Amino acid sequence: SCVRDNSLVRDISQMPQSSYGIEGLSHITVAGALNHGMKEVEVWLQTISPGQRTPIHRHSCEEVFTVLKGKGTLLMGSSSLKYPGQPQEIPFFQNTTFSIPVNDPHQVWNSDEHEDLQVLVIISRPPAKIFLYDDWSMPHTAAVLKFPFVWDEDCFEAAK
Amino acid sequence: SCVRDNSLVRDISQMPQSSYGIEGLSHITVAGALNHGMKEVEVWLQTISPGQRTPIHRHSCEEVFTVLKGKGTLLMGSSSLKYPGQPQEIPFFQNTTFSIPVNDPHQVWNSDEHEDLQVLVIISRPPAKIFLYDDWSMPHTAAVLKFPFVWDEDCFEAAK
Ligand SMILES: *[C@@H]1O[C@H](CO)[C@@H](O[C@@H]2O[C@H](CO)[C@@H](O[C@@H]3O[C@H](CO[C@H]4O[C@H](CO[C@H]5O[C@H](CO)[C@@H](O)[C@H](O)[C@@H]5O)[C@@H](O)[C@H](O[C@@H]5O[C@H](CO)[C@@H](O)[C@H](O)[C@@H]5O)[C@@H]4O)[C@@H](O)[C@H](O)[C@@H]3O)[C@H](O)[C@H]2NC(C)=O)[C@H](O)[C@H]1NC(C)=O
Ligand SMILES: *[C@@H]1O[C@H](CO)[C@@H](O[C@@H]2O[C@H](CO)[C@@H](O[C@@H]3O[C@H](CO[C@H]4O[C@H](CO[C@H]5O[C@H](CO)[C@@H](O)[C@H](O)[C@@H]5O)[C@@H](O)[C@H](O[C@H]5O[C@H](CO)[C@@H](O)[C@H](O)[C@@H]5O)[C@@H]4O)[C@@H](O)[C@H](O)[C@@H]3O)[C@H](O)[C@H]2NC(C)=O)[C@H](O)[C@H]1NC(C)=O
Ligand SMILES: O=C(O)Cc1cccc2ccccc12
Ligand SMILES: O=C(O)Cc1cccc2ccccc12
Ligand SMILES: [Zn+2]
Ligand SMILES: [Zn+2]
Numbered sequence: 001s002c003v004r005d006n007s008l009v010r011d012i013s014q015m016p017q018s019s020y021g022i023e024g025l026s027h028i029t030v031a032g033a034l035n036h037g038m039k040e041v042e043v044w045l046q047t048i049s050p051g052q053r054t055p056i057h058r059h060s061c062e063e064v065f066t067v068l069k070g071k072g073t074l075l076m077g078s079s080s081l082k083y084p085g086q087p088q089e090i091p092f093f094q095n096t097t098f099s100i101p102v103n104d105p106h107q108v109w110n111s112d113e114h115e116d117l118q119v120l121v122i123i124s125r126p127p128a129k130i131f132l133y134d135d136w137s138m139p140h141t142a143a144v145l146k147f148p149f150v151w152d153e154d155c156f157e158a159a160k
Numbered sequence: 161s162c163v164r165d166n167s168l169v170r171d172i173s174q175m176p177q178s179s180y181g182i183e184g185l186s187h188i189t190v191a192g193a194l195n196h197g198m199k200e201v202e203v204w205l206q207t208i209s210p211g212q213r214t215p216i217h218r219h220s221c222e223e224v225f226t227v228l229k230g231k232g233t234l235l236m237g238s239s240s241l242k243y244p245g246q247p248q249e250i251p252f253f254q255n256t257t258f259s260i261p262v263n264d265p266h267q268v269w270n271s272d273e274h275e276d277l278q279v280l281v282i283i284s285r286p287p288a289k290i291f292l293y294d295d296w297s298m299p300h301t302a303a304v305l306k307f308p309f310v311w312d313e314d315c316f317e318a319a320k
Binding site: 008009010011012013030031036038039040041043061062064066074076088090091092093095096097098099120122123124125 | 168169170171172173190191196198199200201203221222224226234236250251252253255256257258259280282283284285
């Protein structure tokens, strides 16, 4: 569904959450472009189950994560050579933050075997324009744009 | 002193908090322009003590709040009158979100007597350009710009 709501105070617990077909994910856009009218920043609340990973991807915007619960590993590559290259792998834990430089290819993995990972994610220039890589050797020109992304599809179609 | 941190993954409990001379405030810039190099978004973590309030102010950027703990009241003024005017009082509670229209005058109040209010705040176009009002009756044209703001003064002076 597309749930639009521009009032000023909104209850996060009442904004319908979904995996959008991504196994192990639970997503809520807390404040965003297509659902609420934002123009410069957008905020997501996401929970990833044990062992799950996001796809390898990039987006031409700033992006900041804050870890509410759980632990994991951040994988990041470079945006300057013709492909991402073998990534940096950096562990993170509850109450850590990390920002992804514009266009850097990255992946977030919930490497804990038992607890869910819950983060707040903030982006600039919404909505997100995510290009997907199938592995760290795929060249940057070859990444596939998936726009709108699955949590924006219903509202993107409703706004034409 | 100015604390600059060029690290990718940071522990938020080790970024130094301060009131910056604002009674009942505790602030940490989680990811920002002067402290970490951000250009498009900046993220703060703020705790306000029971009864305390931010000054009445406005800023030419988007601003989104997410309430992590506690509860309170958002006070919103007019951007169409020549002054903010008597404010609308909008209650908010744990797990709510609110976005402040660009340039609207507002104040956040911890109207709870029992527990601290903690919020994650996101702004666009950092660092903040905050104009202060002495009361809801002050004309928009008389509001005073305080730049750099108190949590940016040390790095702004160090930058020279
Ligand atoms: C991730 O890590 C984060 C960082 O560690 C965590 O957030 C922090 O959580 C702390 C633990 O709960 C939390 O500590 C509480 O701070 C509040 C809020 O504080 C201020 O006001 C206090 C109370 O005030 C009044 O009385 C005073 C005398 O009693 C008067 O002086 C005053 O004017 C007023 O009327 C003040 O005592 C306090 O003041 C000072 O403290 C500053 C340091 O904060 C100094 O700069 C200053 O000189 C002086 O020492 C504050 O201004 C308290 O009310 C409460 O009892 C705890 O101290 C802290 O605030 C949180 N930080 C932020 C930025 O939010 C977070 O929880 C972690 N999250 C996860 C998921 O793990
Ligand atoms: C502020 O409000 C927030 C919103 O209410 C709240 O955050 C919510 O908190 C709840 C409670 O803790 C969380 O619920 C937890 O969700 C996790 C993770 O869920 C996802 O993964 C599970 C497990 O997946 C895998 O295992 C299954 C087998 O069981 C496989 O099929 C699968 O492939 C994987 O291997 C999965 O079952 C979930 O899927 C279902 O649910 C989604 C909806 O989320 C449907 O769309 C889907 O079709 C299906 O029914 C999902 O993919 C779960 O494991 C836990 O058991 C528990 O349910 C929410 O995740 C969380 N929401 C967000 C967005 O983070 C805040 O906590 C609250 N905060 C405060 C301060 O109060
Ligand atoms: O922008 C990010 O890194 C978040 C993110 C981007 C793309 C796909 C995702 C799937 C599941 C969870 C998060 C995801
Ligand atoms: O509404 C805001 O921009 C945050 C904010 C702006 C100005 C002063 C403040 C004092 C204490 C806590 C937050 C404050
Ligand atoms: Zn990303
Ligand atoms: Zn403000």
